[PDB]
Amino acid sequence: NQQKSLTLIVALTTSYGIGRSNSLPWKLKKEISYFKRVTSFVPTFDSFESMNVVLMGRKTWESIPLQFRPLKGRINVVITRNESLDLGNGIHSAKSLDHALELLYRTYGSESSVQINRIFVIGGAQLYKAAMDHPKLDRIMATIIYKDIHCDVFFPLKFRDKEWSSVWKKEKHSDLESWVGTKVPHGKINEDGFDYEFEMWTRDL
Numbered sequence: 336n337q338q339k340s341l342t343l344i345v346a347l348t349t350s351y352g353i354g355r356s357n358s359l360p361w362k363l364k365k366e367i368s369y370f371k372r373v374t375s376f377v378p379t380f381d382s383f384e385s386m387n388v389v390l391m392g393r394k395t396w397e398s399i400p401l402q403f404r405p406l407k408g409r410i411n412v413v414i415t416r417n418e419s420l421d422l423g424n425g426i427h428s429a430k431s432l433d434h435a436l437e438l439l440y441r442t443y444g445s446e447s448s449v450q451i452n453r454i455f456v457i458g459g460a461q462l463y464k465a466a467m468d469h470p471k472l473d474r475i476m477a478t479i480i481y482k483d484i485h486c487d488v489f490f491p492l493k494f495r496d497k498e499w500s501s502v503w504k505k506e507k508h509s510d511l512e513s514w515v516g517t518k519v520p521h522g523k524i525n526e527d528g529f530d531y532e533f534e535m536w537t538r539d540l
């Protein structure tokens with residue numbers, strides 16, 4: 336199994352809402368744009384052999400545009416308990432997060448050209464819940480949507496509330512850009528009627 340640390344990436348409203356009717360209820364191409372630099376930024380040097388992995392629950396699998404997947408230039412994995420089958424041309428399915436890490440280790444690492452850098456959990460609500468309970472999850476890359484938009488799916492942990500202030504801490508913007516690479520919009524950003532912000536949250540293992 337594991338070695339390295341997991342990163343969770345999410346776009347939620349101040350009330351923890353993350354979905355509605357199996358899609359992510361807003362229109363943000365600058366915020367969708369950010370999910371890509373994050374999810375695929377491997378340091379210039381290692382950039383030769385190293386590729387990032389995004390992990391996802393099947394619904395999200397589904398919820399991702401036909402045109403958009405499999406997410407390019409990242410090993411794509413899907414977590415589905417009842418691994419029925421899986422259409423793909425080199426995309427895995429794993430019974431859990433745990434099985435998924437064992438599948439990547441076994442598969443890569445060894446007699447491979449392909450090495451993994453950073454491992455991401457992109458969702459959904461079900462997979463988010465299991466990564467939050469994983470001893471290896473230490474960081475949350477969160478976009479905050481400052482609107483009380485109607486959702487039917489919620490982030491399972493109020494990580495930003497007082498109840499969790501001795502475990503998750505909001506890091507400095509400078510260390511947010513230092514972790515991604517690229518320069519990232521400081522403050523409040525407004526695109527399509529909404530005000531949002533980029534935060535990086537970290538916990539100690």
Ligand SMILES: NC(=O)c1ccc[n+]([C@@H]2O[C@H](COP(=O)([O-])OP(=O)(O)OC[C@H]3O[C@@H](n4cnc5c(N)ncnc54)[C@H](OP(=O)(O)O)[C@@H]3O)[C@@H](O)[C@H]2O)c1
Nearest residue numbers: 346354357358392393394395415416458459460461462465
């Ligand atoms: N705002 C955001 O950033 C954001 C990001 C991602 C998702 N969301 C949204 O959330 C919605 C989908 O959320 P969701 O919670 O319903 O679905 P999900 O986790 O995306 O898909 C759920 C399925 O995936 C598998 N799965 C998830 N956690 C698992 C575990 N611990 N062990 C085994 N299988 C697990 C199971 O699949 P089987 O049924 O195949 O066993 C479970 O029914 C959509 O609106 C999606 O777009 C929002």
Ligand SMILES: COc1cc(CN(C)c2cnc3nc(N)nc(N)c3c2)cc(OC)c1
Nearest residue numbers: 344345346359370395398399400403457478
């Ligand atoms: C092109 O790549 C995609 C990926 C999705 C997957 N998805 C539900 C989604 C969307 N935005 C997100 N934003 C941030 N910060 N974090 C996430 N975890 C996230 C997840 C949907 C999509 O169609 C518009 C395009």
